[PDB]
Each structure stands twice: as C-alpha cells, then as structure tokens.
Backbone as ProteinMPNN parsed JSONL, in Angstrom:
{"seq_chain_A": "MNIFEMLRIDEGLRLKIYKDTEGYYTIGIGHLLTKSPDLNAAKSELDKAIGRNCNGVITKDEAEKLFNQDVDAAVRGILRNAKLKPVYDSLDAVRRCAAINQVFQMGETGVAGFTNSLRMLQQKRWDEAAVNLAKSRWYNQTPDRAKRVITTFRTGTWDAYK", "coords_chain_A": {"N_chain_A": [[177.964, 69.062, 137.082], [174.557, 69.247, 135.961], [171.0, 69.204, 135.371], [170.58, 70.933, 133.169], [173.131, 71.222, 131.908], [173.469, 68.592, 131.285], [171.302, 67.917, 129.568], [171.943, 69.739, 127.572], [174.349, 68.661, 126.557], [173.207, 66.204, 125.538], [171.302, 67.029, 123.665], [172.342, 69.044, 122.177], [173.036, 72.263, 120.581], [171.403, 74.056, 118.269], [170.853, 76.784, 116.118], [169.327, 77.175, 113.894], [166.344, 75.943, 112.316], [166.214, 72.433, 112.445], [166.064, 68.857, 111.749], [165.138, 66.491, 114.175], [166.284, 63.378, 115.705], [164.252, 61.775, 115.007], [163.287, 62.807, 112.709], [161.861, 65.143, 112.895], [160.936, 68.599, 112.858], [162.8, 70.907, 114.657], [164.37, 73.087, 117.043], [167.082, 74.943, 118.55], [167.87, 73.88, 121.798], [166.955, 70.993, 121.488], [164.22, 71.69, 121.142], [161.222, 70.728, 120.215], [159.391, 71.503, 117.369], [157.249, 70.781, 115.736], [155.487, 67.845, 114.58], [154.709, 67.752, 112.032], [155.496, 67.313, 108.557], [155.763, 69.613, 107.121], [157.667, 72.318, 106.485], [156.887, 74.961, 106.649], [154.865, 74.906, 108.555], [156.315, 74.266, 110.794], [157.94, 76.609, 110.899], [155.875, 78.519, 111.487], [155.172, 77.599, 114.061], [157.546, 78.081, 115.349], [157.687, 80.901, 115.26], [155.503, 81.59, 116.759], [156.306, 80.507, 119.201], [158.5, 82.086, 119.893], [157.627, 84.661, 119.636], [158.063, 86.462, 117.574], [158.919, 87.24, 114.114], [160.796, 84.837, 112.937], [161.919, 83.659, 110.793], [162.992, 81.024, 110.677], [165.238, 80.956, 112.281], [166.972, 81.492, 115.341], [168.281, 83.228, 118.293], [171.006, 82.544, 120.617], [170.254, 83.191, 123.19], [167.476, 83.091, 122.921], [167.134, 80.367, 122.331], [168.007, 79.316, 124.801], [166.099, 80.338, 126.451], [163.777, 78.955, 125.532], [164.616, 76.445, 126.249], [164.816, 76.546, 129.072], [162.02, 76.871, 129.612], [161.166, 74.418, 128.568], [162.508, 72.466, 130.081], [161.493, 73.002, 132.637], [158.743, 72.482, 132.075], [158.862, 69.738, 131.486], [159.61, 68.637, 134.065], [157.472, 69.554, 135.633], [155.423, 68.221, 134.331], [156.121, 65.536, 134.993], [155.7, 65.727, 137.764], [152.902, 66.014, 137.782], [152.058, 63.628, 136.874], [150.574, 60.737, 137.744], [151.673, 58.158, 137.689], [154.389, 58.64, 137.343], [155.24, 60.537, 139.282], [155.494, 59.37, 142.023], [157.697, 57.613, 141.608], [159.718, 59.334, 140.657], [159.896, 60.99, 142.909], [160.904, 59.221, 144.709], [163.548, 58.988, 144.03], [167.051, 59.891, 144.285], [168.868, 63.031, 143.783], [170.534, 62.979, 141.448], [169.646, 60.788, 139.932], [167.025, 61.688, 139.527], [167.556, 63.656, 137.632], [168.133, 62.041, 135.423], [165.583, 61.024, 134.984], [164.223, 63.393, 134.299], [165.583, 63.96, 131.941], [164.916, 61.713, 130.358], [162.085, 62.07, 130.06], [162.049, 64.618, 128.844], [163.188, 63.949, 126.377], [161.427, 61.829, 125.515], [158.795, 62.423, 126.196], [155.599, 61.769, 127.692], [153.908, 59.852, 126.677], [154.564, 57.199, 126.373], [154.804, 56.081, 128.904], [153.384, 53.894, 130.147], [154.406, 51.619, 128.879], [156.847, 51.512, 130.181], [156.351, 50.57, 132.693], [157.466, 48.278, 134.118], [160.256, 48.969, 134.302], [159.999, 51.357, 135.771], [158.912, 50.389, 138.179], [161.092, 48.874, 139.09], [163.009, 50.95, 139.353], [161.768, 52.45, 141.41], [161.931, 50.547, 143.399], [164.621, 50.611, 143.765], [166.254, 48.75, 142.494], [168.795, 48.779, 140.877], [170.537, 47.72, 138.798], [168.91, 45.87, 137.58], [166.787, 47.547, 136.775], [168.224, 49.052, 134.905], [168.939, 47.125, 132.983], [166.318, 46.442, 132.161], [165.447, 48.981, 131.13], [166.932, 49.24, 128.816], [165.83, 47.515, 127.039], [164.252, 48.461, 124.762], [162.624, 50.449, 122.253], [163.458, 53.074, 122.509], [166.166, 52.812, 123.528], [167.294, 51.369, 121.369], [167.068, 53.083, 119.163], [168.244, 55.485, 119.933], [170.976, 54.74, 120.992], [173.495, 55.608, 122.136], [172.944, 57.917, 123.605], [170.833, 56.952, 125.235], [172.277, 54.979, 126.654], [173.921, 56.647, 128.26], [171.974, 57.94, 129.834], [170.773, 55.805, 131.059], [173.013, 54.73, 132.453], [173.263, 56.777, 134.315], [170.826, 56.485, 135.695], [171.423, 53.955, 136.724], [173.656, 54.27, 138.378], [173.474, 56.669, 139.865], [175.413, 58.634, 139.567], [177.393, 61.084, 137.82], [178.984, 59.934, 135.894], [178.707, 59.12, 133.233], [178.631, 61.452, 131.833], [180.988, 62.692, 132.065]], "CA_chain_A": [[176.887, 68.628, 136.163], [173.189, 69.459, 136.389], [170.087, 68.828, 134.299], [170.786, 71.789, 132.019], [174.37, 70.835, 131.241], [173.242, 67.212, 130.837], [170.48, 67.961, 128.362], [172.713, 70.472, 126.558], [175.171, 67.613, 125.938], [172.414, 65.207, 124.818], [170.424, 67.616, 122.668], [173.13, 69.979, 121.367], [172.434, 73.569, 120.41], [171.389, 74.553, 116.897], [170.05, 77.991, 116.06], [168.438, 77.095, 112.731], [165.481, 74.764, 112.32], [166.812, 71.166, 111.984], [165.237, 67.707, 112.058], [165.676, 65.695, 115.27], [166.631, 61.997, 115.376], [163.031, 61.165, 114.495], [162.939, 63.498, 111.459], [160.904, 66.216, 113.202], [161.496, 69.938, 112.93], [163.256, 71.177, 116.014], [165.341, 74.178, 117.053], [167.623, 75.287, 119.868], [168.313, 72.714, 122.569], [165.906, 69.979, 121.401], [162.86, 72.185, 121.234], [160.427, 70.167, 119.12], [158.46, 72.531, 116.878], [156.064, 70.11, 115.215], [155.69, 66.561, 113.904], [154.372, 68.008, 110.626], [156.545, 67.333, 107.537], [155.701, 70.888, 106.429], [158.599, 73.282, 107.064], [156.159, 76.193, 106.953], [154.137, 74.688, 109.795], [157.376, 74.409, 111.798], [158.228, 78.045, 111.01], [154.774, 79.142, 112.216], [155.294, 77.211, 115.469], [158.709, 78.783, 115.876], [157.384, 82.315, 115.431], [154.567, 81.61, 117.896], [157.07, 80.2, 120.422], [159.453, 83.152, 120.184], [156.904, 85.935, 119.642], [158.545, 87.349, 116.506], [159.113, 86.55, 112.855], [162.157, 84.358, 113.09], [162.381, 83.075, 109.533], [163.689, 79.75, 110.873], [166.488, 81.195, 112.984], [166.868, 82.13, 116.654], [169.521, 83.534, 118.979], [171.342, 81.629, 121.696], [169.399, 83.574, 124.309], [166.134, 82.575, 122.627], [167.213, 78.913, 122.525], [168.127, 79.012, 126.213], [164.767, 80.617, 127.01], [162.916, 77.811, 125.227], [165.164, 75.306, 126.994], [164.322, 76.783, 130.431], [160.592, 76.526, 129.597], [161.003, 72.99, 128.25], [162.969, 71.657, 131.234], [160.454, 73.287, 133.638], [157.527, 71.768, 131.662], [159.155, 68.313, 131.673], [159.541, 68.29, 135.49], [156.103, 69.787, 136.064], [154.686, 67.075, 133.791], [156.423, 64.403, 135.86], [155.003, 65.94, 139.048], [151.462, 65.877, 137.55], [151.8, 62.299, 136.376], [150.315, 59.821, 138.859], [152.595, 57.024, 137.611], [155.771, 59.084, 137.405], [155.593, 61.317, 140.482], [156.08, 58.601, 143.147], [158.998, 57.098, 141.226], [160.611, 60.466, 140.628], [160.126, 61.505, 144.273], [161.704, 58.213, 145.399], [164.919, 59.074, 143.559], [168.047, 60.9, 144.634], [168.923, 64.166, 142.864], [171.194, 62.683, 140.173], [168.696, 59.933, 139.2], [165.944, 62.589, 139.109], [168.006, 64.271, 136.366], [167.942, 61.05, 134.373], [164.149, 60.998, 134.752], [163.891, 64.623, 133.533], [166.174, 63.774, 130.619], [164.106, 60.75, 129.62], [160.809, 62.708, 129.725], [162.403, 65.668, 127.885], [163.334, 63.289, 125.08], [160.372, 60.894, 125.141], [157.477, 62.867, 126.643], [154.936, 60.876, 128.648], [152.914, 58.963, 126.053], [155.023, 55.815, 126.498], [155.01, 55.724, 130.308], [152.851, 52.568, 130.493], [155.414, 50.673, 128.415], [157.979, 51.465, 131.105], [155.847, 50.11, 133.998], [158.434, 47.414, 134.793], [161.442, 49.784, 134.62], [159.603, 52.286, 136.825], [158.789, 49.622, 139.43], [162.459, 48.572, 139.499], [163.595, 52.2, 139.823], [161.217, 52.765, 142.742], [162.485, 49.535, 144.29], [166.078, 50.79, 143.783], [166.94, 47.613, 141.894], [169.398, 49.613, 139.829], [171.076, 46.985, 137.646], [167.716, 45.314, 136.949], [166.154, 48.67, 136.099], [169.05, 49.435, 133.758], [168.718, 46.083, 131.975], [164.973, 46.618, 131.601], [165.339, 50.229, 130.366], [167.635, 49.064, 127.535], [164.992, 46.665, 126.192], [163.311, 49.489, 124.343], [162.822, 51.236, 121.059], [164.278, 54.189, 122.951], [167.564, 52.428, 123.552], [167.768, 50.937, 120.051], [167.055, 54.211, 118.24], [169.293, 56.409, 120.368], [171.667, 53.97, 122.027], [174.563, 56.266, 122.867], [172.294, 58.794, 124.555], [170.138, 56.104, 126.217], [173.328, 54.404, 127.506], [174.303, 57.679, 129.24], [170.855, 58.193, 130.744], [170.647, 54.559, 131.818], [174.13, 54.701, 133.423], [172.889, 57.749, 135.329], [169.829, 55.777, 136.522], [172.024, 52.784, 137.348], [174.691, 54.636, 139.361], [173.258, 57.974, 140.472], [176.581, 59.48, 139.401], [177.489, 61.767, 136.539], [180.132, 59.34, 135.209], [178.464, 59.015, 131.782], [178.698, 62.791, 131.265], [182.334, 63.103, 132.541]], "C_chain_A": [[175.52, 68.876, 136.793], [172.307, 69.173, 135.18], [170.261, 69.655, 133.012], [172.011, 71.391, 131.218], [174.216, 69.461, 130.603], [172.417, 67.192, 129.567], [171.135, 68.734, 127.229], [173.676, 69.538, 125.819], [174.335, 66.686, 125.028], [171.655, 65.748, 123.618], [171.192, 68.529, 121.729], [172.48, 71.351, 121.366], [172.547, 73.926, 118.933], [170.411, 75.705, 116.764], [169.155, 78.088, 114.844], [167.559, 75.863, 112.835], [166.244, 73.561, 111.734], [165.805, 70.055, 112.261], [165.912, 66.891, 113.162], [165.921, 64.257, 114.779], [165.461, 61.276, 114.747], [162.546, 61.812, 113.2], [162.028, 64.705, 111.649], [161.562, 67.555, 113.403], [161.62, 70.389, 114.367], [164.158, 72.398, 115.929], [165.946, 74.272, 118.44], [168.245, 74.082, 120.536], [167.184, 71.671, 122.617], [164.494, 70.485, 121.619], [162.086, 71.714, 120.013], [159.433, 71.233, 118.663], [157.154, 71.897, 116.452], [156.46, 68.755, 114.655], [155.28, 66.618, 112.437], [155.595, 68.013, 109.705], [156.645, 68.673, 106.797], [156.596, 71.88, 107.155], [157.886, 74.58, 107.436], [155.383, 76.098, 108.262], [155.112, 74.822, 110.963], [157.771, 75.861, 111.994], [157.141, 78.849, 111.732], [154.913, 78.86, 113.717], [156.463, 77.921, 116.108], [158.345, 80.225, 116.198], [156.438, 82.519, 116.608], [155.322, 81.395, 119.21], [157.958, 81.363, 120.867], [158.761, 84.516, 120.309], [157.423, 86.945, 118.628], [158.697, 86.554, 115.237], [160.547, 86.118, 112.727], [162.763, 83.94, 111.775], [163.384, 81.938, 109.792], [164.976, 79.808, 111.66], [166.279, 81.941, 114.303], [168.25, 82.433, 117.226], [169.796, 82.503, 120.067], [170.487, 81.905, 122.906], [168.004, 83.006, 124.14], [166.102, 81.051, 122.801], [167.245, 78.558, 124.015], [166.818, 79.314, 126.915], [163.809, 79.461, 126.765], [163.309, 76.617, 126.079], [164.705, 75.369, 128.461], [162.833, 76.39, 130.548], [160.375, 75.024, 129.446], [161.416, 72.107, 129.414], [161.926, 71.77, 132.352], [159.184, 72.468, 133.336], [157.683, 70.258, 131.822], [158.971, 67.9, 133.149], [158.118, 68.455, 136.006], [155.176, 68.686, 135.551], [154.873, 65.832, 134.652], [155.646, 64.536, 137.17], [153.471, 65.831, 138.978], [151.067, 64.462, 137.173], [151.746, 61.333, 137.545], [151.224, 58.593, 138.862], [154.041, 57.453, 137.825], [156.145, 59.746, 138.723], [156.171, 60.473, 141.63], [157.458, 58.004, 142.853], [160.039, 58.208, 141.279], [160.925, 60.892, 142.075], [160.901, 60.494, 145.117], [163.194, 58.319, 145.127], [165.75, 60.141, 144.245], [168.159, 61.935, 143.508], [169.497, 63.808, 141.485], [170.251, 61.813, 139.318], [167.457, 60.706, 138.734], [166.288, 63.287, 137.789], [167.859, 63.317, 135.195], [166.472, 60.948, 133.988], [163.706, 62.221, 133.939], [164.374, 64.492, 132.095], [165.291, 62.857, 129.788], [162.755, 61.357, 129.163], [160.973, 63.851, 128.708], [162.477, 65.065, 126.498], [162.045, 62.604, 124.621], [158.951, 61.361, 125.41], [156.923, 61.825, 127.591], [154.041, 59.828, 127.996], [153.273, 57.492, 126.209], [155.3, 55.338, 127.915], [154.55, 54.308, 130.647], [153.761, 51.431, 130.028], [156.564, 50.48, 129.399], [157.565, 51.093, 132.535], [156.864, 49.274, 134.774], [159.722, 48.135, 135.194], [161.159, 50.705, 135.807], [159.475, 51.595, 138.175], [160.19, 49.322, 139.971], [163.22, 49.808, 140.002], [163.078, 52.549, 141.208], [161.733, 51.797, 143.81], [163.981, 49.702, 144.514], [166.845, 49.521, 143.398], [167.651, 48.138, 140.653], [169.882, 48.858, 138.603], [169.921, 46.364, 136.863], [166.949, 46.373, 136.161], [166.899, 48.984, 134.813], [168.939, 48.405, 132.627], [167.337, 46.233, 131.34], [164.848, 47.872, 130.705], [165.907, 50.087, 128.955], [166.855, 48.205, 126.549], [163.88, 47.527, 125.64], [163.659, 50.034, 122.97], [163.715, 52.421, 121.376], [165.764, 53.885, 122.861], [168.061, 52.128, 122.134], [167.89, 52.057, 119.019], [168.076, 55.258, 118.632], [170.19, 55.759, 121.406], [172.727, 54.741, 122.796], [174.007, 57.192, 123.947], [171.582, 57.974, 125.636], [171.129, 55.423, 127.168], [173.774, 55.369, 128.61], [173.223, 57.852, 130.294], [170.682, 56.988, 131.649], [171.78, 54.391, 132.832], [173.867, 55.624, 134.612], [171.838, 57.146, 136.261], [170.446, 54.632, 137.322], [172.913, 53.176, 138.529], [174.42, 55.822, 140.26], [174.52, 58.82, 140.536], [176.538, 60.095, 138.02], [178.566, 61.173, 135.629], [179.943, 59.321, 133.686], [178.606, 60.364, 131.063], [180.048, 63.472, 131.512], [182.334, 63.858, 133.875]], "O_chain_A": [[175.347, 68.735, 138.004], [172.813, 68.927, 134.085], [170.107, 69.134, 131.908], [171.944, 71.239, 129.998], [174.755, 69.194, 129.529], [172.782, 66.529, 128.596], [170.913, 68.429, 126.058], [173.804, 69.617, 124.598], [174.718, 66.42, 123.888], [171.391, 65.018, 122.663], [170.751, 68.771, 120.605], [171.492, 71.579, 122.064], [173.649, 74.081, 118.407], [169.277, 75.624, 117.235], [168.313, 78.982, 114.762], [167.981, 74.844, 113.382], [166.842, 73.661, 110.663], [164.8, 70.284, 112.935], [167.113, 66.627, 113.097], [165.782, 63.965, 113.592], [165.64, 60.286, 114.038], [161.516, 61.417, 112.653], [161.485, 65.233, 110.679], [162.613, 67.654, 114.035], [160.695, 70.274, 115.171], [164.662, 72.716, 114.852], [165.389, 73.742, 119.402], [169.038, 73.356, 119.937], [166.54, 71.49, 123.65], [163.665, 69.794, 122.211], [162.268, 72.234, 118.912], [158.713, 71.802, 119.483], [156.077, 72.405, 116.764], [157.617, 68.533, 114.298], [155.475, 65.659, 111.69], [156.609, 68.635, 110.021], [157.514, 68.845, 105.943], [156.326, 72.246, 108.299], [158.239, 75.224, 108.424], [155.256, 77.082, 108.99], [154.784, 75.414, 111.991], [157.924, 76.309, 113.13], [157.452, 79.758, 112.502], [154.789, 79.766, 114.541], [156.394, 78.321, 117.27], [158.655, 80.72, 117.282], [156.553, 83.491, 117.354], [155.009, 82.03, 120.217], [158.144, 81.594, 122.061], [159.25, 85.408, 121.001], [157.243, 88.15, 118.803], [158.616, 85.326, 115.26], [161.425, 86.932, 112.441], [163.985, 83.871, 111.645], [164.467, 81.897, 109.208], [165.726, 78.833, 111.71], [165.508, 82.899, 114.372], [169.263, 81.957, 116.712], [168.933, 81.691, 120.4], [170.038, 80.979, 123.581], [167.413, 82.5, 125.093], [165.146, 80.511, 123.357], [166.587, 77.61, 124.442], [166.455, 78.629, 127.871], [163.106, 79.031, 127.68], [162.457, 75.875, 126.567], [164.262, 74.366, 129.02], [162.445, 75.669, 131.468], [159.518, 74.435, 130.105], [160.754, 71.111, 129.706], [161.525, 70.766, 132.94], [158.62, 71.84, 134.231], [156.749, 69.575, 132.244], [158.265, 66.936, 133.444], [157.613, 67.599, 136.732], [154.255, 68.267, 136.251], [153.904, 65.156, 134.998], [155.015, 63.584, 137.628], [152.819, 65.584, 139.992], [149.882, 64.128, 137.152], [152.736, 61.13, 138.248], [151.514, 58.045, 139.926], [154.828, 56.717, 138.42], [157.248, 59.539, 139.229], [157.227, 60.814, 142.163], [158.293, 57.902, 143.752], [161.106, 58.045, 141.87], [162.084, 61.124, 142.417], [161.493, 60.863, 146.131], [164.01, 57.807, 145.893], [165.233, 61.152, 144.72], [167.615, 61.743, 142.421], [168.996, 64.285, 140.467], [170.08, 62.069, 138.126], [166.903, 60.414, 137.674], [165.422, 63.484, 136.937], [167.5, 63.735, 134.094], [166.145, 60.803, 132.81], [162.912, 62.099, 133.006], [163.673, 64.862, 131.153], [164.952, 63.179, 128.649], [162.345, 61.172, 128.017], [160.136, 64.024, 127.822], [161.9, 65.599, 125.55], [161.62, 62.775, 123.478], [157.999, 60.762, 124.91], [157.677, 61.083, 128.222], [153.469, 58.994, 128.698], [152.394, 56.631, 126.183], [155.953, 54.314, 128.113], [155.251, 53.591, 131.361], [153.875, 50.406, 130.699], [157.179, 49.415, 129.445], [158.337, 51.279, 133.476], [157.102, 49.529, 135.955], [160.223, 47.938, 136.301], [161.97, 50.819, 136.726], [159.881, 52.146, 139.198], [160.449, 49.492, 141.163], [163.983, 49.72, 140.963], [163.859, 52.905, 142.09], [161.943, 52.174, 144.963], [164.559, 49.016, 145.357], [167.935, 49.257, 143.907], [167.179, 47.967, 139.53], [169.662, 49.307, 137.478], [169.945, 46.333, 135.633], [166.518, 46.135, 135.033], [166.289, 49.162, 133.758], [168.855, 48.771, 131.455], [167.203, 46.157, 130.119], [164.215, 47.82, 129.65], [165.431, 50.727, 128.017], [167.177, 48.168, 125.361], [162.713, 47.359, 125.994], [164.823, 50.077, 122.574], [164.623, 52.742, 120.611], [166.522, 54.6, 122.207], [169.136, 52.587, 121.746], [168.718, 51.985, 118.111], [168.71, 55.861, 117.766], [170.183, 56.161, 122.569], [172.855, 54.55, 124.005], [174.529, 57.247, 125.061], [171.714, 58.27, 126.823], [170.852, 55.303, 128.361], [173.978, 54.96, 129.753], [173.508, 57.905, 131.49], [170.472, 57.126, 132.854], [171.536, 53.953, 133.956], [174.2, 55.305, 135.754], [171.943, 57.278, 137.48], [170.044, 54.369, 138.456], [172.923, 52.498, 139.557], [175.058, 55.974, 141.302], [174.684, 59.629, 141.449], [175.755, 59.687, 137.162], [179.015, 61.835, 134.693], [180.907, 59.486, 132.938], [178.692, 60.413, 129.836], [180.232, 64.653, 131.216], [183.394, 64.246, 134.365]]}, "name": "protein", "num_of_chains": 1, "seq": "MNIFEMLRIDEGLRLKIYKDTEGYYTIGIGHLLTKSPDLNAAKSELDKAIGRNCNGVITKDEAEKLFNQDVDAAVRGILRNAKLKPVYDSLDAVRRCAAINQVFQMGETGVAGFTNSLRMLQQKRWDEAAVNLAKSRWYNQTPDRAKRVITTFRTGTWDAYK"}
C-alpha cells in the first residue's frame, strides 16, 4: 500500500465527468473540476486541465496524470502550510499518507477547525487524535472513508485498506 493505491481506493476512477460526494463536478481519481453547478463550466475546466477538447471524457492515462499532479500538489501544499508542515513532518510514513489523503479530500481551508486533532497527532496521542478527528462534518458526511483514514492515523498501519 502507498498513497496512490490508498487514494485510488478512496476516490475510485471514473473517466466521465461525475459529481463527487458534495455534488461537485469531478473526473478521474477525485479530480475536482469546479464547484459551479454549470456542467459547461466543468467541461471548460476539464479541457483546460487536459489540454484538449475532451467533451467530458478522459482516458485512464489522463486520469492518472491528473492524479499525479493532484497528489504532488496536496503534499506540496502541506509542506507550505505553517500549521500542517510540523505535524506532517512529525509523522511516520504511513500516518503521512493519512495526512495527504485528508488534504486531498478536504483541501486546507478547514485546517484551523482541526487545531486540536493536529496537536494530538503531533503529540502522538493516537487514540485521542482519532476520537477528535471523528467529531467532524468530515466524518459524518463520509464516515466509511473517514474511518479508514482515521484508523490509519490511529495505528500507522495499512489495516483499514487491507
């Protein structure tokens, strides 16, 4: 297991524009196209992302390319984030994957809400962190996925992903 296989499980792979769990146009392996309700706006974003006229459809190679860019951008974002970087750098490799997964899904706008979870993670208070992480819109809206990510943070093993 690695971050790619982990996010591939959590995000799936769809080659046609679909709506994510939040109702937003997405393609590939959880590549968010736009929060606009306008399918045409999503199609424009897709064509810009791929560099061709996709008419709402991409190849597996194209999805994996976007995924590579997206995973890279997630980690680089974490490393640029003054609140996230020290927590992330405190973690072992498996827990770092959980951090990448969480940011991939959630972005960074809600980092301040997770101040207490982040402190507990940096402190390596794993069960406490896991209890705190679950007290979230995140957990309640995507519980099965959040349970996996949280188990990963709690144990630093890949048990939740088999």
